Ligand binder design. Structure first.
Ligand SMILES: Cc1cn([C@H]2C[C@H](OP(=O)(O)O)[C@@H](COP(=O)(O)O)O2)c(=O)[nH]c1=O
Ligand SMILES: [Ca+2]
Length: 129
């Protein structure tokens, strides 16, 4: 897989940012994860964690997997990196998302995120508390 450039247009919630990619505005949805929505428990904390991570980053990058690159809503599907740190992975690691929506051929980082969730679950972090 390879990292490609984008710039933050706006942090939306745990699951999504609007990013500019190849010069065009797009909503991106994070592969392999599910954060609580805003009114659910840890929903606000997930959005704050993502917002801070992507807003403080000097460099935002997107990384597509082998399969579908846009979902049925036209959202880009990618792993998102903030100064080289994967945001998808860091949400799970922190107990602010679960590994979810693991589809065949779009799941290269499945095992890496499942390990992160195991540790968050072991530390009883947030969602796992
Ligand atoms: C993460 C992800 C979601 N989706 C679709 C499936 C779900 O459909 P439905 O809207 O029909 O449930 C929806 C979940 O996204 P959200 O968790 O952002 O709602 O997005 C994909 O098709 N591919 C993906 O990789
Ligand atoms: Ca969600």
């Amino acid at each position: 897989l390879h990292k490609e450039p984008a710039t933050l247009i706006k942090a939306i919630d745990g699951d999504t940012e609007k990013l500019m990619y190849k010069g065009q505005p797009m909503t991106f949805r994070k592969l392999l994860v599910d954060t609580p929505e805003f009114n659910e428990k840890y929903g606000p904390e997930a959005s704050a964690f993502t917002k801070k991570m992507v807003e403080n980053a000097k460099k935002i990058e997107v990384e597509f997997d082998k399969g579908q690159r846009t979902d049925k809503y036209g959202r880009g599907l990618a792993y998102i990196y903030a100064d080289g740190k994967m945001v998808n992975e860091a949400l799970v690691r922190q107990g602010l998302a679960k590994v979810a929506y693991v589809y065949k051929g779009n799941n290269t980082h499945e095992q890496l995120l499942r390990k992160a969730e195991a540790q968050a679950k072991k530390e009883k972090l947030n969602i796992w508390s």
